[PDB]
Design a protein around this ligand. Structure first.
Ligand SMILES: CCCN(c1nc(-c2nc(N)cc(N)n2)cs1)c1cc(-c2ccc(S(=O)(=O)N3CCN(C)CC3)cc2C(F)(F)F)ccc1C
Ligand SMILES: CCCN(c1nc(-c2nc(N)cc(N)n2)cs1)c1cc(-c2ccc(S(=O)(=O)N3CCN(C)CC3)cc2C(F)(F)F)ccc1C
Ligand SMILES: O=c1ccn([C@@H]2O[C@H](COP(=O)(O)OP(=O)(O)O)[C@@H](O)[C@H]2O)c(=O)[nH]1
Ligand SMILES: O=c1ccn([C@@H]2O[C@H](COP(=O)(O)OP(=O)(O)O)[C@@H](O)[C@H]2O)c(=O)[nH]1
Ligand code: NA
Ligand code: NA
Lengths: 230, 230
């Protein structure tokens, strides 16, 4: 029993947290690593740091993007490594579902902040150097990715449903930019990364435009079929 | 042959680079890891990043202290790990001399930037969390420390001798602040760190107020005697 590592990827309010909370309940061999940033957006020193840096980011992204992206990624690596070393000992078919990955940290979020001039060149090059190196110090490489594909308009509506005050100002245009990056990475596979194995990792794309909270059985059936091929 | 790891510590322009370049020549079992920041202060992507972030630091320390301290420390860990895995295979008595340590990064430099309000609380807490964790991902723990002890006035004179344009404005008061931290850490051993073994690590203190470039044999004799006790 080597733990299978599966990333759940998708735009803001696509339904990843909803989907991962469904999956965790369906099997004692299935565990989840919620995204650190998602927990900061609700006591611990990480949550106090994370809440401060997220609020400062909303005020002045061009000051705080580097600090935020480095702490978000380190927080994720720590939480993923903890689960990998903690859980599913004596699972028959152990699967750990990551809410997003170190790859979404860099290729979706940090990349967009650089493209939006919220990181300068030095900040972005330091970040990529840090990421290239931080990742080689290995056991987190993915067996597969599940892409929850929703339209920007769907994600905008779901930001409205979730009702976090800080997010109600997010424009469609931001969601469209993140959507294009996800489509380039996980559908067209046009995106060049510095992680050669990712070109070859299996991807399951699930259309989650339709509400699935009370009607997810088809989605899970595709997950179980995907898992059996890995 | 397990490599002995020895940090050379001391104030700005105490003579660490001079001393470490003397030591490296005296034995094929002796290798040195120059300090990354020292190389930025003279082609590689690290040097271009480092030169940019050092120049920006001089302009606006309260913007760049967090970015600088995180890149300086990661650059040091990478260079120390490279030497540890690269060199002194088939040395009889292998010794690797580190120009400063991850401990001087945090307890001398980053601590002073926090105390000078060039990092806010969140920046300083994120930095310490990053450092606590980054260090546990181990083989860099020190067998000993060599403290090159000079007066602030001596170090001020040696900044004048070395003649880097960017450093000629450094005030005595800065040197006195760094001196007090080194005395608390390595002489009085009053400084509380989060690394329990450091309380117990042997320290050799060498007085380097007197010029040693052509008269270092006494200093080296004390280093060889120190090494034989480890
Ligand atoms: C819920 C989103 C929170 N949010 C972010 N989160 C992450 C993040 N990083 C992870 N590694 C993991 C992870 N889970 N999350 C990164 S940044 C965030 C985003 C913006 C922001 C940015 C760029 C546009 S833009 O490209 O549309 N554009 C630019 C040109 N102009 C100004 C116009 C606007 C927009 C916006 C916006 F709208 F959200 F504010 C501002 C702050 C914040 C905290
Ligand atoms: C050669 C020193 C370069 N320098 C630095 N290097 C490092 C460093 N970090 C490593 N992890 C490793 C390593 N090798 N080096 C950290 S910061 C640096 C220092 C200052 C700076 C800071 C504080 C005072 S102060 O406390 O005296 N004080 C404060 C209140 N007021 C304003 C008055 C002044 C002074 C100064 C000064 F003088 F050097 F500028 C400004 C920028 C810079 C790059
Ligand atoms: O099929 C769904 C999926 C999500 N949501 C709602 O959409 C919002 C965003 O979902 P989630 O938090 O899971 O998005 P994530 O940001 O985690 O992808 C929440 O208010 C969910 O309750 C929904 O009503 N039906
Ligand atoms: O015994 C000594 C030690 C140092 N120096 C000079 O002092 C300056 C600072 O020395 P170093 O660069 O070694 O200091 P570090 O910052 O590496 O401690 C340089 O110009 C050295 O040539 C000197 O003249 N005599
Ligand atoms: Na479960
Ligand atoms: Na040598």
């Amino acid at each position: 029993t080597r733990i299978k590592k599966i990333s759940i990827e998708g735009n803001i309010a696509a339904g990843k947290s909803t989907f991962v909370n469904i999956l965790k309940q369906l099997s004692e061999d299935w565990e989840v690593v919620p995204e650190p940033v998602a927990r900061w957006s609700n006591l611990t020193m990480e949550q106090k740091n994370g809440g401060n840096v997220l609020q400062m980011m909303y005020e002045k992204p061009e000051r705080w993007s580097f600090t935020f992206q480095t702490y978000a990624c380190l927080s994720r690596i720590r939480a993923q490594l903890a689960s990998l070393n903690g859980k599913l000992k004596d699972a028959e078919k152990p699967v750990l579902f990551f809410e997003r990955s170190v790859y979404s940290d860099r290729y979706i979020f940090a990349s967009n902040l650089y493209e939006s001039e919220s990181m300068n060149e030095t900040e972005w090059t330091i970040y990529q150097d840090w990421h290239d190196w931080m990742n080689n110090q290995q056991s987190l490489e993915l067996d597969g990715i599940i892409y929850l594909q929703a339209t920007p308009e769907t994600c905008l509506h779901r930001i409205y449903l979730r009702g976090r005050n800080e997010e109600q100002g997010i424009p469609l245009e931001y969601l469209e930019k993140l959507h294009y990056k996800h489509e380039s990475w996980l559908l067209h596979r046009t995106l060049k990364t510095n992680f050669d194995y990712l070109q070859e990792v299996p991807i399951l794309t699930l259309d989650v435009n339709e509400d699935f909270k009370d009607k997810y059985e088809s989605l899970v059936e595709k997950v179980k079929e995907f898992l059996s091929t890995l």
